[PDB]
Amino acid sequence: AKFRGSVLAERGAMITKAESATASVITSLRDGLYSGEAQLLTASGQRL
Amino acid sequence: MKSVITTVVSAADAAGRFPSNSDLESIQGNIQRSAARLEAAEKLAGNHEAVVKEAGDACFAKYAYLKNPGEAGENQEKINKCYRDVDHYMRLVNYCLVVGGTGPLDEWGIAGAREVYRTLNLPTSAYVASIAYTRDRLCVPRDMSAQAGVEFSAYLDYLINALS
């Protein structure tokens, strides 16, 4: 019980940070970012 | 403090009238009922160590978050007060089956209970988890008679409806 009580705030804060990144990559993809001619000319920007 | 006797002698005292034939008739109903509630008061007062030990950890098997640090029972002196807080409520149910009304549960267990538990941050849902465990644990021919368990289960959800 003491172990969980010490890590509860650490764990929920790292999950909120991971979902703020997914929301940013989705609005950034629709906002025209990653569509540039320099992004499609790389091989990892073609997979994205 | 709230009985069959005390309501009918306070309704007569408020009008300034004698004990009539109405309130003599109502304490006749205290004669036929006290055969059945004084064996629920007797069965509770010799078995109370077992019934508050198994109702106390029905709270903590439903809410194991209360044993976390910073919560309501986080060390052993706060867990031991929770089993004391449950045993205080089961003793006032025993006083209500002896008095025959909701008198001792009102002025010793329920009045001020919402002020104390909101200030000291105690969950009332984990108080009703211990009381509603013993309401469902009661067997009708095994633990008492039929009408002893009607009176035992009626003072238990008086306590549930005052805390919920």
Added chain:
Amino acid sequence: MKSVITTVVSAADAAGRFPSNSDLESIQGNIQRSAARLEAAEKLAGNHEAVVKEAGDACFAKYAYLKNPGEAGENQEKINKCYRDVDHYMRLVNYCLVVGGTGPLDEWGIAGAREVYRTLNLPTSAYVASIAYTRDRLCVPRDMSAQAGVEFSAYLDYLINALS
């Protein structure tokens, strides 16, 4: 309108609460008493021409001065009011045995009565002798049953005490 039911629902409404176990078992006393008082009300209903003519002439056989001129009885109709005025007081005692309280005797027979008879010069002592003749007529296996006659006697000298 003052029985064991309307004295607990007008006492729980004053505090703003539900009918609890003390209210629910004071109507248990209206179960195991109503075999007696409904028996004594049935004997009053089928004999009410007889028990007013044993009783209503007793105020004239004892307070004989009322049949003199310039008094409370001058003609046959004022005597016929007096057997009518006491038959109302036997109808309301029949109403009190079926309700189970002192409801209709207070609201219809006793309230206002002291400032009626003082104005109209009707003696209350000449009412009581017609009631108190009926009170010692009770013969416990003959007229009604033994426990029926106790509650019949109680409403008769509540009426005597309100007229004394």
Added chain:
Amino acid sequence: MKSVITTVVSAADAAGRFPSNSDLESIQGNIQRSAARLEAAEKLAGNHEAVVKEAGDACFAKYAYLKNPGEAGENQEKINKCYRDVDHYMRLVNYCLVVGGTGPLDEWGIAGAREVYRTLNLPTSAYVASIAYTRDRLCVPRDMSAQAGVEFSAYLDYLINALS
């Protein structure tokens, strides 16, 4: 007495709450105004005997009929109490400039004045003539600052509206 601070710690007291964030915001306006009215009170405190010997005889220049034998100035010693009455009002104008409201003016100079001046036949029109003169002798760059002359003049015609 009736300052900024006591009118918010008595409204918190009547509702039964702690000093809120709006209660501290009223004391913030007591900070910025205190430079204006405490230089209007320090100016009045060192100049107080000069301004009452010129506003005292503005009564007697205007209302000269009250030096006749039969009126409120019979002799010399009443006129020295007439300067004493107007030096008391300038002291309370000085006290209500320090405090921050009309506390000392209301409880010590206004309340009761309708009954004392009526029964002792001292005219309220000739008190107003002594206070309306010293309101109009003030010009805002000579005697004090601009806003020091506003709040000195704001407590003077509060006294004139109270007395008339």
Added chain:
Amino acid sequence: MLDAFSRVVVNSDAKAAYVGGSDLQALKSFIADGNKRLDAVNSIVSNASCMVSDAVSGMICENPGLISPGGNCYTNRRMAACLRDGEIILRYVSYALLAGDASVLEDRCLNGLKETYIALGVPTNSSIRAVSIMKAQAVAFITNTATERKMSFAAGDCTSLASEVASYFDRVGAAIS
């Protein structure tokens, strides 16, 4: 006010009749089914806090324009007043079930509720829905057919009390309409 024992004596007082054994057989049968009435008020007031909160939350989840701004159950002060309004109604029904007639539901609660809710702005058609859920909960509690709660009763029929308490909950909807 009036119970079932004294409703039949204001009828006898209108003809000055002695109430004898002819209309007593209806009233001797009241005390015959007297333990059934006492178990039926006990099954209502034991579940009375769950009955109130389920009724207003089913009124909310069927008309969710009461939670919208400018709705009547909008803020916390108005949702708490609706929970307080709705347990007055369940309190005065259970007096009238315990008495035998509705002479305390009509004088003490319903006398002046229609013109009180109009001056306040309370929607009346949602108030019919909150008491019709409470009518359906009450006839499922005193006939022992609730799905999430079973109470221990003796064996018999109790449908003449379920039709009686449906008439008390329909007098509430006929007054505020």
Added chain:
Amino acid sequence: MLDAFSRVVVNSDAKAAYVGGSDLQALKSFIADGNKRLDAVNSIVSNASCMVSDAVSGMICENPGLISPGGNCYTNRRMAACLRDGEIILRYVSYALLAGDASVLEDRCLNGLKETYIALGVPTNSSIRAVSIMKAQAVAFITNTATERKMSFAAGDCTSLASEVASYFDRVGAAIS
């Protein structure tokens, strides 16, 4: 009833004197540290529900005979009044810190509190422990030296505002003993 500005004018009405210039720079210094008085009241009233619960339950843990049958904090009815009694005391010492002197504390709270508590059964030397825990909590908040909540202020020194709020908590214990 009186603030710090009204205290010096009822001291100078007794001499029939004007409030001059040498009795103003002790009062113009009230205004100059006036933003620190406003931050000190704000750091008491913010974390004030933790203050009256740590003081009463820390008084219980040093005299646990108030919890015994016969103590004055025994039932729920008395413990709810003791936690309510303690936050009247914290309310009136924050009125006296905001105003600058203890005249609303001495009139509306302490005049008659000893004869209230003696007639009602309150142990008057266990109530001085709940006020003296509250004095220790209040001087650790307006000097920012609590170990579990820090607040954010400007740089400087408030050891004279903490020195007079202890002088209002000592006035509660002297009016009760």
Added chain:
Amino acid sequence: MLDAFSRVVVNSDAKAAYVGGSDLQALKSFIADGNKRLDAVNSIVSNASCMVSDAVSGMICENPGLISPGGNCYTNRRMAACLRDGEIILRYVSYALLAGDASVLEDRCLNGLKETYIALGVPTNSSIRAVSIMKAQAVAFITNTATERKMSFAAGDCTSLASEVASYFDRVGAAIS
């Protein structure tokens, strides 16, 4: 009851919306021209007993049918009760000028005033003339164009306060009628 800042947040509460940068700018101009509002209240409340004695006696010199018997301001008792009736109206207008809207004027002064004067027989058309002279007195003092008294201000335009105070005095006349 409300002021100009809480009139904004009850409009945003109808839409369940945050009050942000569009209609914050209408409130930042309320605070900026805010010393203009405080001088304009101060000039009303400093000439208030000349202002109510002139509007009531101005109403007498328009219509001298109130000094004949049968008049409503006939007696010595009714002249004091009319000169008190007209300074309640000035007191609630200066609350509404200091606050920023006329919702202290609706709730506390104009609730039931039309029903009072009908039941008293107070004549309605003589009362509108009593507040119209108070309307012309108010806009003279706060644009400083009064003929018998001039007060010292800083220089600038305060005509939108004087167009706001005439909307408050026209609200009193429309509800009496």
Added chain:
Amino acid sequence: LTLPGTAETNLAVPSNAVRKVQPYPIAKPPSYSSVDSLRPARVSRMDADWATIYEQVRRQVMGNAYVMEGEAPDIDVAFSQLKGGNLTVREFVRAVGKSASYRTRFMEAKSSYNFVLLNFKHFLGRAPTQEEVSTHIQILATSGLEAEIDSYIDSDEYKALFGDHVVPYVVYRGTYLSSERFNRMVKANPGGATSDKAKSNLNMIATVAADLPTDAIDVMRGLPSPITSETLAFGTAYYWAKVEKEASEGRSASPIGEKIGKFDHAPISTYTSLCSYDKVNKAPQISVTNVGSDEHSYVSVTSKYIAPDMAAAAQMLADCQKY
């Protein structure tokens, strides 16, 4: 007499010309109050009958008057209209207070300070402060009896506590506006068989509500609280102080010795001038009249007249640096 629906008379504010009667009685005050759970319930118009209502008006508004069967016919008129709906129970206690039965046993038989102290007990169920006394005693000098009773019933304190349908009673609130407002309410309101009738002056609260100091004696406050709050304080411990207090509240001892006016005198053996303490500070009071030939120039030796201890300042004040 008025009309079969009326909520308020006399039109003191404009908002009672549009006001309706309340359909239901008002709720209790929402603070906590642990003493109110030991109290009997509110008697209201909806729940009680007319035997309960007329008894509880006589037990609070009339004190304990012992009203006989023929006496007070004016209250029987105002009760005849209460049952008809013509006036509410707020207006019924306004008709009771302006009646001649309330006047003949509280106004013209008691004192003038003592009349204002009973009106807070009868109409509001508490005791005033000295600032509240001096505003209600100006109405008894400038506007008479009926404008003083009309200021209780039309106050904001009445309509929040009782409203239209609740009989006045002693309200236990929890948080009070001062701590002395609690224990003067309890002192002014004891329980059964009290009856402020031949207690010809109060004299204990008549000098405690004359100072914002002098918090009064705690045995006049431990007495009239509800029991189960004062058991294990009344076996024989504080019990004998209650016995002395009730023998000196009845017969109405004056507190010039112990409570107000407090002069620690010299020792007995340190003077030995006029022998005994019984006749120590006695000096004669002489009053002549000198009107014609009827004088009665009667010298009487008056009692121990004591120092004012208020009129002696003045001394060390009028001559501090002066004289």
